[PDB]
Amino acid sequence: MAVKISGVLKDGTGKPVQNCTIQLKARRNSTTVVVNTVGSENPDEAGRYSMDVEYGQYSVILQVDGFPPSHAGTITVYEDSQPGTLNDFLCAMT
Amino acid sequence: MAVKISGVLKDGTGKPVQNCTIQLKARRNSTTVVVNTVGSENPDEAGRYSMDVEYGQYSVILQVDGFPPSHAGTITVYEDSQPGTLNDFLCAMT
Amino acid sequence: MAVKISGVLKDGTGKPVQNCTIQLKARRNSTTVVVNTVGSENPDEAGRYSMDVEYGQYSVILQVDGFPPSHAGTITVYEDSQPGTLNDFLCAMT
Amino acid sequence: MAVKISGVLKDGTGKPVQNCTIQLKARRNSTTVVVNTVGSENPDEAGRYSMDVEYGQYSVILQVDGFPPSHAGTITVYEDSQPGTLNDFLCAMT
Amino acid sequence: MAVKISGVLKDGTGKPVQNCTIQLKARRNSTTVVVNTVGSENPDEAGRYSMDVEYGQYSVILQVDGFPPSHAGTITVYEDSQPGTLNDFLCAMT
Amino acid sequence: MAVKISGVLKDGTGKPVQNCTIQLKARRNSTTVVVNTVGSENPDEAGRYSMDVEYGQYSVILQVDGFPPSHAGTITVYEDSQPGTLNDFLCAMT
Amino acid sequence: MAVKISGVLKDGTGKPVQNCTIQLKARRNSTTVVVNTVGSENPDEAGRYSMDVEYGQYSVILQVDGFPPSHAGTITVYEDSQPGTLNDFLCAMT
Amino acid sequence: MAVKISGVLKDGTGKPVQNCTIQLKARRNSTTVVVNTVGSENPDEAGRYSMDVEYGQYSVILQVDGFPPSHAGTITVYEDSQPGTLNDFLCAMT
Amino acid sequence: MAVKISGVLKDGTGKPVQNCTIQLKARRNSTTVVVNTVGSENPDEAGRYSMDVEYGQYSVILQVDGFPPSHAGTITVYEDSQPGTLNDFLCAMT
Amino acid sequence: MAVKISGVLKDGTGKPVQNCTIQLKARRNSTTVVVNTVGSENPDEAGRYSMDVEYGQYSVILQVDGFPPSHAGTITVYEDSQPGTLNDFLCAMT
Amino acid sequence: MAVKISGVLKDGTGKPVQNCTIQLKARRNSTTVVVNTVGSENPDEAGRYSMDVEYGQYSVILQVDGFPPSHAGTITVYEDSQPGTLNDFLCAMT
Amino acid sequence: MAVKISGVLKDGTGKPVQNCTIQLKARRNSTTVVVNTVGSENPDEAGRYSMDVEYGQYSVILQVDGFPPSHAGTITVYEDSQPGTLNDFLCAMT
Questions:
Q1: In chain L, helix, strand, coil percent, each to 5?
Q2: Do F53 and D9 touch (CB under 8 A)?
Q3: In a domain? residue D27
Q4: What is the distance, to the nearest Å, from the Cα of residue F37 to the centroid of all Cα atoms in its chain?
Q5: CB-based contact L88 K31, cutoff 8 Å
Q6: Residues of chain A contacting B34 with CB distance shorter than 8 Å
Q7: How many CB pairs under 8 A join B and D?
Q8: How many CA atoms lie within 13 A of E70 on its CB side?
């Protein structure tokens, strides 16, 4: 199953960030994802993003049209996670 | 929420600075801001600035047209912070 | 005898991978295959793959148009193996 | 408030110095001036200069089309100083 | 006498491999073969191969216009062997 | 108040020097002269010079059209000084 | 006299070798052959060769069009030697 | 006052030297001559020279558009001397 | 007197060797030959050679258009030698 | 006073020296000749030379058109010296 | 008195040497020959040479058109020597 | 007085040597010759030379447009020598 990861993506001054590109980098083999595979997603102009993420361990990469990739960190989804925003997984007590 | 930061910024000789821009770079990802994201604002011709800032720790950069980028310092916006000028956050005890 | 390897190939965000290529390298020569021989097959537009592999040890290579070759890992198919996705074969205990 | 620094600028032969530029490089964060902000002031043909200086610590630089920028020294304006000339601030007992 | 070697050459995915070339590099002087002599014989489009090997010691080279020559291993033909496939000679207990 | 420094400046053989230039460089800033400020006049065709020198310590440079700059020495005009030739100030006891 | 050396020249797979050349370099001067002298003669398409060789020690070279020269070994034709193929002398006990 | 120095400049064969030039390099600050000042006096075709030197210490340089400047020696015009020739000052017991 | 050295020059295959040239490099002064002198002899198409050698010590160099000069060795002719072939002098027990 | 230096200039084979030039260089400055001053004369076509030299130490140089400058030696002509050839002065006891 | 040296110089194969030249170099000056003087003679078409040499010690050089100059050796013609070939002088006991 | 040196100049093979040039390089100052003065003398086509040498010490150079100048040696002529050939002076007991 795919857990829904949804939210809005704002910069540090309360405005949406445009030209974004969010990438999920698999680091270990899962039941349905092969290692070293990237899954991309492009937010809209208002900053809304929504993805269907398969469980496993991933590295998050954020690219904004003139930014070298910003390694936000590693997220992990098990068979107990509930739908939420991307930021909670980064801030979650791993 | 967001704390409102408003004021006017000048130089030693009591004049507004022109063609400048303030950039806040988030050095630690938060519940609403992802790490390593810059949010910028250009003051008006009178040097007046006004912007809504999300909580967390930020690094402040001033860029003036021609001059090398200046690293003013680091600010921290907590849940108990009250509105004020940008200078007080720089001068706040750490 | 050739075990049937069937499945669908997706990434972290639950989408098929296009322009992909799956290669199997015979690591150790067997009574049916000769060592250092590559066998590859391109999945369809929906990311569905089905191959008939001979038994032995193989190293799996994932090739994507644009990215450098990925080293998924190593599979070892015995005479007693049952049909299934290659994801189970990489994640099988060794 | 701004202390009013006024005077005349003469060289060693008792003559006005032209094509000058007095700049104030702020070295510490103040309640009204951000770090590394320069404010220029060009005196008239008779060597008269007058500036309104916000209190704090400054490094005075005197740039003439000729000798490289001459570091006159560091000046400091508390909230007790009275209006005067820049030479007294340079020569004041720190 | 010439031992007949016959078989079908397949890659890891149970398919014939085309454009190949099997070379037998003789490493030791035999009664009828001089050292460092090669014999090339290309199999058909269905992967069928057959040679008339003279007894002795040989190194097998599999050249497939691609990966460099693949030293599959030394074969040895005694004067008590029976006709078979090349893979058995590779896998034979030396 | 500027001491008057007047006289005639000749060479070893008793002739006036033409195309000359006398430069005073303030090595230490005073209440009326800022540090590292140069003052120069060209003497007349007869080698006669007249100066209104502010109090303080200066370094004297002799510049002739063609020769490299000469370093005559250092003078120090106190408050008890009296008008006289420049040549005495270098030769005064220190 | 001359010992007769007649036979056919096959390769590992039982085929004749074309564009071949046998070279006999005399490594020790004899009653009838001076040192460091070669004699080269071309076998036919069937691979047959016929050589009347004088006594002494020789080094045998196979030169086949395209390949680097091959050093088959060294032969020693004595007075008690009987006619035979070239392979027997190389394979003879030394 | 100026000490008159006159004479005739003859080379080693009792002949006048032409195209000559005598320079007096002041080496110590005097009451009437600034340090590092040169005064030339070109003799006539018959080798006669006559100068009006001031008191002090001088280095005599002899430039003859040829051999490089010849540092003859240092002359001191003590304020008890009487007019003479240049050679007497060189030969004088300093 | 000159001893007659005659014979037929054959290679290891038992054939005449054409395009040859035999040279005798004298290494010590003799009664009739000065040291470091070479005398060439070109055999005919059937390999026959015949020279009239003066007694002494020589080094024989057999040069053919091809392989580099092959120094067969040293020959010595004393006042006891009988006419023969070149090969005997090489093989003679010196 | 001046000593008369006269004579004829000859070489080993009793011949006049043509295109010659005699140079006297004042080694030590005296009451009549300044130091490092050269006085030269050219002998006539028969090699006859005559000059009037002042007292002191001189280094004598012979310059011939084509040959490198020769350093004949050093002469020391005194107050009591008698007229003669420069050969005697060069050969005089020192 | 010049001893006459006459003879014919051959090579190993009993032939005259053409385009030759014999050089005698005097290595020690004598009462009739100055040191380092080279006297040469070209033998005729039949190899016959006839020279007459002065007494002393000489180095004998052979020069042949095509080969680098040979160093034949050393001879010493005394006052008691008898006319003979050049070869005997080389072989004479020393 | 000049000693008369006369003779004939022959090489090692009893023939005159042409194109020669005898040079006398003086080494010490004499009463009539200055150091490092050379006097040439070209002999005629018959090798005859006759020179007049002033007494002293000389080094003899023999330039023959060939071998570089040859140091024949030192010749000393006192006021007792009698006329003779150049070779005797070289061979004379020094």
A1: 5, 45, 50
A2: no
A3: yes
A4: 14
A5: yes
A6: 9, 62, 70, 72, 86-87, 90
A7: 65
A8: 22
Q: What's the gap in Å between the CA of H92 and the closest CA on chain J?
A: 10
Structure tokens at D70: 């001459």
Alpha carbons within 13 angstroms on the beta-carbon side of residue I36 total 12
Residue with tokens 């290494």: I27
Helices of type H across chain I: 86-91
Counting the structural domains of chain L, the total is: 1
Query: Per this entry, what is the length of chain B?
Result: 94
Distances from the Cα of H43 to the Cα of H2, H8, H22, J31, angstroms? 19, 9, 8, 18
CB contact under 8 A, E87 and C58: no
Residue A83 lies in a domain: no
CB burial of residue A60 (10 Å; 0-12, 13-18, 19+):
buried
What Å distances lie between residue H49 and H83, J17, J29, CA to CA? 13, 38, 18
What does DSSP assign to residue G17? P
Tell me if chain J has a CB within 8 Å of the CB of H88: yes
Residues of chain F with C-beta less than 8 angstroms from the C-beta of H40: 13
Residues 6+ apart with CB under 8 A from G91: E29, E30, E31
**Cα pseudo-dihedral I65, I68, I71, I72, rounded to 10:** -60
* Interfacial D residues in 60-79 facing B (CB < 8 Å): none
| Distance (Å, whole) CA F77 – CA F56 | 5
Answer yes or no: do B39 and A11 touch at CB < 8 A: yes
Nearest to F17 among H31, H37, H53 (CB): H37
Gap between the Cα atoms of D62 and D77, Å rounded: 18
Contacts of H7 in chain J (CB under 8 A): none
Largest distance between two CA atoms of chain G:
40
Q: Which residues pair with L8 in a beta bridge?
A: L48
Cβ within 8 Å, pair F29-D62: no
CB contact under 8 A, L39 and J72: no
How far is the C-alpha of B40 from the C-alpha of B69, rounded, in Å?
Answer: 13
| K92 Rama class: left (phi>0) / alpha (psi -120 to 50) / beta | beta
- Contact residues, chain L, for J11 at CB < 8 Å: 24, 26, 33, 37-39
Identity of the residue numbered F7: G
Residues whose CB falls within 8 Å of the CB of residue D28, separated by 6 or more in sequence, listed in order:
D35, D56, D57
Q: Report the C-alpha dihedral over residues J25, J39, J74, J12, rounded to 10 degrees.
A: 140
Asked whether the beta carbons of residue I70 and residue G31 sit closer than 8 angstroms, the reply is no
With beta carbons less than 8 A apart as the criterion, state whether J17 and J9 touch: yes
Q: Note whether E54 contacts G: Cβ–Cβ < 8 A.
A: yes
Mutate to test the interface with I, among G1, G4, G32 (most CBs of I within 10 A): G32
Mutate which of D5, D28, D32 to test chain B, going by most B C-beta atoms within 10 A?
Answer: D32
User: Which of H6, H18, H25, H42 is CA-nearest to residue J37?
Assistant: H18
Range of the domain at J32: 3-91
Which residues are CB-contacts of L23 (< 8 A; sequence separation ≥ 6)? Answer: L38, L39, L40, L60, L61, L62, L63, L69
For the record, the structure tokens of C11 come out as 């990434």
Residues in Cβ contact with F10 at an 8 Å cutoff, skipping those fewer than 6 apart: F16, F17, F47, H32, H33, H54
The method recorded for this entry reads cryo-EM
CATH of the domain at J36: 2.60.40.1120
Cβ–Cβ under 8 Å, residues H22 and H48: no
Say how many CB pairs under 8 Å bridge A and C. 66
CA–CA gap between residue F60 and residue F73 (Å, rounded): 6
Say what the alpha-carbon torsion angle A78, C17, A60, A87 is, to the nearest 10 degrees: -60
Strands B70-77 and F70-77: unpaired
